[PDB]
Design a protein around this ligand. Structure first.
Ligand SMILES: CCc1cncnc1N1CCN(Cc2nc3cc(C(F)(F)F)ccc3[nH]2)CC1
Ligand SMILES: [Zn+2]
Length: 291
Protein backbone atom coordinates (compact mmCIF):
# COMPACT_ATOMS: atom_id res chain seq x y z
CA UNK A 1 0.00 0.00 0.00
CA UNK A 2 1.98 2.98 -1.27
CA UNK A 3 1.55 6.09 0.92
CA UNK A 4 3.48 9.32 1.73
CA UNK A 5 5.05 7.87 4.93
CA UNK A 6 6.69 5.16 2.74
CA UNK A 7 9.17 7.82 1.62
CA UNK A 8 11.70 9.92 3.48
CA UNK A 9 12.08 13.49 2.17
CA UNK A 10 15.76 14.09 1.38
CA UNK A 11 15.93 17.44 -0.39
CA UNK A 12 14.04 19.83 -2.69
CA UNK A 13 14.99 19.47 -6.34
CA UNK A 14 12.48 22.10 -7.58
CA UNK A 15 9.87 24.50 -6.20
CA UNK A 16 7.06 26.00 -8.29
CA UNK A 17 3.69 27.60 -7.85
CA UNK A 18 1.97 24.22 -8.15
CA UNK A 19 4.20 22.33 -5.73
CA UNK A 20 7.64 20.74 -5.29
CA UNK A 21 9.85 17.99 -6.59
CA UNK A 22 11.81 16.08 -3.93
CA UNK A 23 14.58 13.53 -3.92
CA UNK A 24 13.22 10.74 -1.64
CA UNK A 25 14.30 7.45 -0.08
CA UNK A 26 11.90 4.52 0.17
CA UNK A 27 11.90 3.44 3.83
CA UNK A 28 9.35 0.59 3.89
CA UNK A 29 8.49 -2.44 1.72
CA UNK A 30 10.77 -4.46 -0.57
CA UNK A 31 12.64 -1.65 -2.32
CA UNK A 32 13.78 -0.25 1.06
CA UNK A 33 16.61 2.29 0.55
CA UNK A 34 15.90 2.90 -3.11
CA UNK A 35 16.20 6.56 -4.17
CA UNK A 36 13.42 8.16 -6.27
CA UNK A 37 12.19 11.56 -7.34
CA UNK A 38 8.78 12.61 -5.90
CA UNK A 39 6.49 15.28 -7.32
CA UNK A 40 3.93 16.69 -4.89
CA UNK A 41 1.20 18.86 -6.44
CA UNK A 42 -1.10 21.20 -4.48
CA UNK A 43 -4.68 20.02 -5.15
CA UNK A 44 -6.33 23.29 -4.15
CA UNK A 45 -4.14 25.26 -6.59
CA UNK A 46 -5.23 22.91 -9.39
CA UNK A 47 -8.85 21.80 -8.69
CA UNK A 48 -10.21 25.25 -9.63
CA UNK A 49 -8.52 25.49 -13.03
CA UNK A 50 -10.01 23.23 -15.73
CA UNK A 51 -7.12 22.97 -18.15
CA UNK A 52 -4.74 22.42 -15.18
CA UNK A 53 -6.76 19.47 -13.78
CA UNK A 54 -6.80 17.97 -17.31
CA UNK A 55 -3.03 18.40 -17.71
CA UNK A 56 -2.46 16.77 -14.26
CA UNK A 57 -4.47 13.68 -15.37
CA UNK A 58 -2.63 13.63 -18.73
CA UNK A 59 0.85 13.51 -17.16
CA UNK A 60 -0.21 10.66 -14.98
CA UNK A 61 -1.63 8.70 -17.94
CA UNK A 62 1.28 9.39 -20.35
CA UNK A 63 4.07 8.37 -17.96
CA UNK A 64 2.33 5.16 -16.85
CA UNK A 65 1.63 4.09 -20.47
CA UNK A 66 5.07 4.99 -21.90
CA UNK A 67 8.09 2.73 -21.34
CA UNK A 68 11.11 3.98 -23.31
CA UNK A 69 14.80 4.31 -22.46
CA UNK A 70 14.84 8.07 -23.22
CA UNK A 71 11.69 8.98 -21.30
CA UNK A 72 11.49 9.34 -17.50
CA UNK A 73 9.80 6.43 -15.74
CA UNK A 74 6.83 6.63 -13.39
CA UNK A 75 7.10 4.12 -10.48
CA UNK A 76 4.10 4.99 -8.23
CA UNK A 77 1.20 7.46 -8.15
CA UNK A 78 -1.17 8.21 -5.23
CA UNK A 79 -3.39 10.92 -3.65
CA UNK A 80 -4.15 12.43 -0.25
CA UNK A 81 -6.75 14.96 0.89
CA UNK A 82 -4.86 17.92 -0.57
CA UNK A 83 -1.87 16.55 -2.57
CA UNK A 84 -1.16 14.49 -5.69
CA UNK A 85 2.03 12.31 -5.53
CA UNK A 86 4.10 11.03 -8.46
CA UNK A 87 7.11 8.77 -7.73
CA UNK A 88 9.50 8.89 -10.68
CA UNK A 89 12.95 7.37 -11.21
CA UNK A 90 15.67 9.59 -9.78
CA UNK A 91 17.92 10.93 -12.53
CA UNK A 92 21.32 11.99 -11.29
CA UNK A 93 22.87 13.44 -14.45
CA UNK A 94 21.35 16.93 -14.21
CA UNK A 95 19.77 18.87 -17.07
CA UNK A 96 21.07 18.94 -20.63
CA UNK A 97 21.07 22.73 -20.10
CA UNK A 98 23.91 22.37 -17.55
CA UNK A 99 26.16 20.53 -20.08
CA UNK A 100 25.45 23.26 -22.70
CA UNK A 101 26.33 26.01 -20.14
CA UNK A 102 29.61 24.27 -19.27
CA UNK A 103 30.62 23.81 -22.92
CA UNK A 104 29.27 27.03 -24.48
CA UNK A 105 29.02 25.31 -27.87
CA UNK A 106 28.83 21.57 -28.54
CA UNK A 107 31.03 19.94 -31.18
CA UNK A 108 28.89 18.45 -33.94
CA UNK A 109 29.41 14.84 -32.73
CA UNK A 110 28.30 15.83 -29.20
CA UNK A 111 25.13 17.55 -30.47
CA UNK A 112 24.50 14.67 -32.87
CA UNK A 113 24.48 12.14 -30.03
CA UNK A 114 21.88 14.05 -27.91
CA UNK A 115 19.71 15.00 -30.89
CA UNK A 116 19.72 11.40 -32.12
CA UNK A 117 18.53 9.98 -28.73
CA UNK A 118 15.91 12.79 -28.52
CA UNK A 119 14.62 11.94 -32.03
CA UNK A 120 13.84 8.43 -30.74
CA UNK A 121 11.97 9.58 -27.63
CA UNK A 122 10.09 11.99 -29.94
CA UNK A 123 9.32 9.24 -32.46
CA UNK A 124 7.99 6.96 -29.69
CA UNK A 125 5.70 9.67 -28.32
CA UNK A 126 4.30 10.44 -31.78
CA UNK A 127 3.49 6.72 -32.26
CA UNK A 128 1.29 7.08 -29.16
CA UNK A 129 -0.30 10.39 -30.28
CA UNK A 130 1.65 12.45 -27.73
CA UNK A 131 3.22 15.87 -28.51
CA UNK A 132 6.14 17.14 -26.41
CA UNK A 133 6.02 20.83 -27.42
CA UNK A 134 9.03 22.33 -25.71
CA UNK A 135 12.53 20.92 -26.20
CA UNK A 136 14.32 23.67 -24.33
CA UNK A 137 17.52 22.28 -22.75
CA UNK A 138 16.13 22.44 -19.16
CA UNK A 139 13.37 19.96 -20.11
CA UNK A 140 15.89 17.30 -21.05
CA UNK A 141 17.67 15.48 -18.21
CA UNK A 142 20.48 12.95 -18.31
CA UNK A 143 20.46 9.58 -16.51
CA UNK A 144 23.42 8.42 -14.37
CA UNK A 145 25.33 7.25 -17.54
CA UNK A 146 24.68 10.47 -19.48
CA UNK A 147 21.84 9.26 -21.72
CA UNK A 148 18.92 11.52 -22.53
CA UNK A 149 15.68 11.61 -20.49
CA UNK A 150 12.63 13.62 -21.53
CA UNK A 151 10.83 14.85 -18.40
CA UNK A 152 8.26 17.72 -18.50
CA UNK A 153 4.93 16.09 -19.14
CA UNK A 154 2.90 17.87 -16.45
CA UNK A 155 2.01 21.29 -15.08
CA UNK A 156 3.92 24.52 -15.61
CA UNK A 157 6.80 24.56 -13.07
CA UNK A 158 6.95 28.36 -12.69
CA UNK A 159 5.82 30.51 -9.74
CA UNK A 160 4.56 33.58 -11.57
CA UNK A 161 2.41 32.51 -14.58
CA UNK A 162 2.30 34.93 -17.31
CA UNK A 163 -1.42 35.84 -17.36
CA UNK A 164 -3.99 33.25 -16.49
CA UNK A 165 -5.07 31.75 -19.82
CA UNK A 166 -2.26 29.31 -20.82
CA UNK A 167 1.09 28.29 -19.81
CA UNK A 168 2.93 28.97 -23.13
CA UNK A 169 4.38 32.31 -22.12
CA UNK A 170 5.37 31.37 -18.54
CA UNK A 171 8.89 30.11 -19.42
CA UNK A 172 11.06 30.75 -22.45
CA UNK A 173 9.28 30.58 -25.84
CA UNK A 174 12.61 30.42 -27.76
CA UNK A 175 12.17 26.74 -28.72
CA UNK A 176 8.44 26.76 -29.53
CA UNK A 177 7.04 26.55 -33.05
CA UNK A 178 5.35 29.62 -34.59
CA UNK A 179 1.90 27.91 -34.66
CA UNK A 180 2.09 27.29 -30.86
CA UNK A 181 2.77 31.00 -30.34
CA UNK A 182 -0.13 31.97 -32.64
CA UNK A 183 -2.48 29.31 -31.14
CA UNK A 184 -3.63 28.54 -34.72
CA UNK A 185 -3.61 24.80 -33.97
CA UNK A 186 -0.72 22.39 -34.26
CA UNK A 187 0.42 18.75 -34.39
CA UNK A 188 3.61 16.63 -34.03
CA UNK A 189 5.49 18.84 -36.57
CA UNK A 190 5.93 21.16 -33.58
CA UNK A 191 8.46 18.73 -32.06
CA UNK A 192 10.65 18.78 -35.14
CA UNK A 193 10.70 22.57 -35.18
CA UNK A 194 11.74 22.44 -31.55
CA UNK A 195 14.44 19.80 -32.21
CA UNK A 196 15.78 22.28 -34.79
CA UNK A 197 15.81 25.17 -32.28
CA UNK A 198 17.65 23.01 -29.69
CA UNK A 199 20.14 21.91 -32.40
CA UNK A 200 20.80 25.51 -33.40
CA UNK A 201 21.31 26.41 -29.69
CA UNK A 202 23.77 23.49 -29.23
CA UNK A 203 25.84 24.37 -32.32
CA UNK A 204 25.92 28.20 -32.07
CA UNK A 205 25.51 28.92 -28.36
CA UNK A 206 22.06 30.55 -28.65
CA UNK A 207 18.50 29.73 -29.90
CA UNK A 208 17.67 30.75 -33.50
CA UNK A 209 15.31 33.71 -32.80
CA UNK A 210 16.11 35.78 -29.74
CA UNK A 211 15.05 39.42 -29.40
CA UNK A 212 15.49 42.08 -26.72
CA UNK A 213 12.03 41.48 -25.20
CA UNK A 214 9.27 38.86 -25.47
CA UNK A 215 7.32 40.68 -28.22
CA UNK A 216 10.37 41.08 -30.51
CA UNK A 217 11.26 37.39 -29.92
CA UNK A 218 7.75 36.27 -30.92
CA UNK A 219 7.94 38.51 -33.99
CA UNK A 220 11.26 36.87 -34.99
CA UNK A 221 9.87 33.34 -34.62
CA UNK A 222 6.71 34.15 -36.71
CA UNK A 223 8.87 35.79 -39.41
CA UNK A 224 11.14 32.77 -39.37
CA UNK A 225 14.07 34.28 -41.29
CA UNK A 226 16.72 31.74 -40.39
CA UNK A 227 20.34 32.92 -40.12
CA UNK A 228 22.59 29.87 -40.75
CA UNK A 229 26.12 30.56 -39.50
CA UNK A 230 28.56 29.74 -42.30
CA UNK A 231 30.97 27.61 -40.14
CA UNK A 232 28.50 24.81 -39.40
CA UNK A 233 28.94 21.73 -41.60
CA UNK A 234 26.99 21.38 -44.82
CA UNK A 235 25.04 18.50 -43.19
CA UNK A 236 24.16 20.49 -40.04
CA UNK A 237 22.99 23.51 -42.12
CA UNK A 238 20.85 21.33 -44.39
CA UNK A 239 19.08 19.72 -41.42
CA UNK A 240 18.50 23.10 -39.66
CA UNK A 241 16.96 24.61 -42.81
CA UNK A 242 14.62 21.62 -43.05
CA UNK A 243 13.55 21.65 -39.39
CA UNK A 244 13.13 25.40 -38.83
CA UNK A 245 10.42 26.13 -41.45
CA UNK A 246 7.44 28.36 -40.87
CA UNK A 247 5.16 25.92 -42.74
CA UNK A 248 4.69 22.97 -40.35
CA UNK A 249 3.63 20.45 -43.02
CA UNK A 250 6.92 20.86 -44.97
CA UNK A 251 9.30 20.35 -42.01
CA UNK A 252 11.49 17.21 -41.99
CA UNK A 253 9.64 14.76 -39.69
CA UNK A 254 6.22 16.19 -40.47
CA UNK A 255 5.36 13.60 -43.15
CA UNK A 256 4.19 9.97 -42.76
CA UNK A 257 7.74 8.83 -41.89
CA UNK A 258 7.93 11.07 -38.76
CA UNK A 259 11.19 10.41 -36.82
CA UNK A 260 12.22 8.16 -39.74
CA UNK A 261 12.51 11.19 -42.04
CA UNK A 262 14.80 13.05 -39.63
CA UNK A 263 16.86 9.97 -38.78
CA UNK A 264 17.63 9.31 -42.43
CA UNK A 265 19.25 12.77 -42.82
CA UNK A 266 23.05 12.75 -43.60
CA UNK A 267 23.71 14.64 -40.35
CA UNK A 268 22.94 11.33 -38.63
CA UNK A 269 24.94 9.10 -41.09
CA UNK A 270 27.29 7.80 -38.34
CA UNK A 271 24.43 6.72 -36.05
CA UNK A 272 23.52 3.07 -35.49
CA UNK A 273 19.85 3.28 -34.38
CA UNK A 274 19.70 -0.20 -32.81
CA UNK A 275 22.80 0.37 -30.68
CA UNK A 276 21.64 3.87 -29.77
CA UNK A 277 18.25 2.64 -28.52
CA UNK A 278 20.06 -0.11 -26.63
CA UNK A 279 22.29 2.52 -24.96
CA UNK A 280 25.51 0.86 -26.15
CA UNK A 281 26.83 4.17 -27.49
CA UNK A 282 29.07 6.03 -25.00
CA UNK A 283 27.72 9.54 -24.18
CA UNK A 284 30.04 12.52 -24.69
CA UNK A 285 29.71 13.43 -20.99
CA UNK A 286 29.47 11.27 -17.89
CA UNK A 287 28.10 13.42 -15.03
CA UNK A 288 29.38 11.17 -12.22
CA UNK A 289 32.90 11.77 -13.51
CA UNK A 290 32.50 15.60 -13.76
CA UNK A 291 33.43 18.01 -10.92
C1 LIG B 1 10.75 14.41 -11.58
C2 LIG B 1 11.86 14.16 -12.60
C3 LIG B 1 13.24 14.30 -11.96
C4 LIG B 1 13.90 13.11 -11.68
N1 LIG B 1 15.11 13.11 -11.13
C5 LIG B 1 15.72 14.21 -10.82
N2 LIG B 1 15.14 15.37 -11.07
C6 LIG B 1 13.91 15.48 -11.63
N3 LIG B 1 13.44 16.78 -11.90
C7 LIG B 1 12.68 17.02 -13.18
C8 LIG B 1 11.84 18.29 -13.12
N4 LIG B 1 12.69 19.38 -12.64
C9 LIG B 1 12.12 20.70 -12.94
C10 LIG B 1 10.85 21.00 -12.13
N5 LIG B 1 9.64 20.54 -12.40
C11 LIG B 1 8.81 21.03 -11.50
C12 LIG B 1 7.44 20.87 -11.31
C13 LIG B 1 6.81 21.51 -10.24
C14 LIG B 1 5.29 21.38 -10.01
F1 LIG B 1 5.06 20.94 -8.79
F2 LIG B 1 4.69 20.61 -10.91
F3 LIG B 1 4.76 22.57 -10.12
C15 LIG B 1 7.56 22.31 -9.37
C16 LIG B 1 8.93 22.46 -9.57
C17 LIG B 1 9.55 21.82 -10.64
N6 LIG B 1 10.80 21.78 -11.06
C18 LIG B 1 13.11 19.21 -11.24
C19 LIG B 1 13.94 17.92 -11.08
ZN1 LIG C 1 2.57 28.81 -15.91
Amino acid sequence: KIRPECFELLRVLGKGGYGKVFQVRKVTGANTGKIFAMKVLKKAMIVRNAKDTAHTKAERNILEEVKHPFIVDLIYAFQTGGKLYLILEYLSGGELFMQLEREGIFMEDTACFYLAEISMALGHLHQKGIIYRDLKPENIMLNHQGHVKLTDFGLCKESIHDGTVTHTFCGTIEYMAPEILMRSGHNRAVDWWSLGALMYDMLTGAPPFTGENRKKTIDKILKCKLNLPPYLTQEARDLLKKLLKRNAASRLGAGPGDAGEVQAHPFFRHINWEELLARKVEPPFKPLLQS
